[PDB]
Copies of this chain bind each other. A is one copy, B any other.
Amino acid sequence: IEEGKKEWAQFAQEIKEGKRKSFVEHLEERGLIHDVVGDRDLLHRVFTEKRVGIYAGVDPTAPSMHVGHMLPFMVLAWGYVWGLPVTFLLGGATSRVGDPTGRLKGREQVHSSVRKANMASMHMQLKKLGASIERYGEKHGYKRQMIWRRTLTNNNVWWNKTPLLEVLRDLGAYIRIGPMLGRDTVKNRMERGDGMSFAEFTYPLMQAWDWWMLFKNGCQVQVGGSDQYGNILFGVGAVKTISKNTVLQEDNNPLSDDLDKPIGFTTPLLTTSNAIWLDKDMTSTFELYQFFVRTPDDAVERYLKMFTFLPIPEISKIMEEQNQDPSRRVAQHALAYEFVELIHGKDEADAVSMQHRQLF
């Protein structure tokens, strides 16, 4: 415990002295940071100086995640093997409301048995992914230390009982609705005329409260998809406010030092040229392999950096061979193999890669 703080301090000096990379500099090299919700240099300083907690959220709208969810979790995977405490947040409660961002119409009311089934399946998959990350990290030389920590939490833990009055007192009373109505997501649904419910309008405050609940236990940073910039931005402000105005003395903190203020960033948007599920029963291992081998030549190098733990030198070596003759798909096959191994294990990766070569 104490040794951890000393180790991170040593790393900090080595980072400033150009002998080591910070977590931010590392992610930038992997191409995993799109936008920083706040000041990039501050984010860098925070991770350099502090072994801060970081989390990513996911709402269970399906029994399975797909490849489109992965980049924020690739960030947490890196965080985990870097010895940062990471948290996977399952939005069991917030999924009932539905995130209005990147939508004009409202989500369709799903039956309760379906939502419960989706939530349970996603919970298992996230547990499985957590163990896979450790295994996959091991393959690439990252040996688990006692100080490592990964957590899976359902926000139902608090949303099932959290009184409306508590949220209004500690957060709602300090939030002006004017700016909320100015946000793009709301503005576009009022202008277009798609309408919007009170529940949807409240969603940002729920996400903010989620962060606050984790922030109290050291989770200073949030990472999300590209379209989550707005929610994370709102969250940064909201968390400062709660910490500054909370009536509980055990939790109250002005956060005067910038190094302690909440901050976040987004991961890049994946574009194409249905869904690619991480569940073997929905998308076979063979088909997940196929999806990645079809990665365009002008995208495969970046994907190798974002979707695998392959060292940069090894990626350079792969690309050197790839650039000589990309028809052999050396880069695409390495990408497909690594990601299939991460999600479904080595045996699956070996089987589908052999069968794919024998067939095509």
A168, A190, A196, A206: residue with the most chain B Cβ atoms closer than 10 Å: A168
Stretch of A70-78, A129-137, A157-165, A214-222 that contacts chain B = A157-165
Bound Cα distance from A165 to B180, whole angstroms: 20
CB distance from A265 to the nearest CB of B (A): 26
State which of B165, B173, B201, B206 has its C-beta within 8 Å of the C-beta of A159. Answer: B165
CB distance from A165 to the nearest CB of B (A): 5
State which of B161, B171, B177, B198 has its C-beta within 8 Å of the C-beta of A168. Answer: B198
Q: How many chain copies?
A: 2
Interchain CB contact under 8 A, B169 and A197: no
Interchain CB contact under 8 A, B169 and A159: no
A96 contacts B by Cβ under 8 Å: yes
Bound Cα distance from A174 to B159, whole angstroms: 19
Could you mark each residue 54-98 of chain A with 1 if its beta carbon is under 8 Å from any beta carbon of chain B, else 0? 000000000000000000000000000000000000000100110
Quick one: which of A4-25 are within 8 Å of B by CB?
none
A178 contacts B by Cβ under 8 Å: yes
Interchain CB contact under 8 A, B159 and A164: yes
State which of B162, B174, B205 has its C-beta within 8 Å of the C-beta of A165. Answer: B162
Residues of chain B contacted by A247 (CB below 8 angstroms): 112
Residues of chain B contacted by A165 (CB below 8 angstroms): 93, 96, 159-160, 162
Chain A residues in the interface with B (C-beta under 8 A): 93, 96-97, 112, 159-165, 167-169, 171-178, 180-181, 190, 195-199, 201-202, 205-206, 247
Known: A163-B163, A164-B206, A178-B190. 19 other contacts (CB 8 A): A159-B164, A160-B163, A160-B165, A163-B164, A164-B167, A168-B198, A168-B199, A168-B202, A171-B198, A172-B197, A172-B202, A174-B197, A175-B197, A175-B198, A177-B195, A177-B198, A177-B201, A180-B198, A198-B205
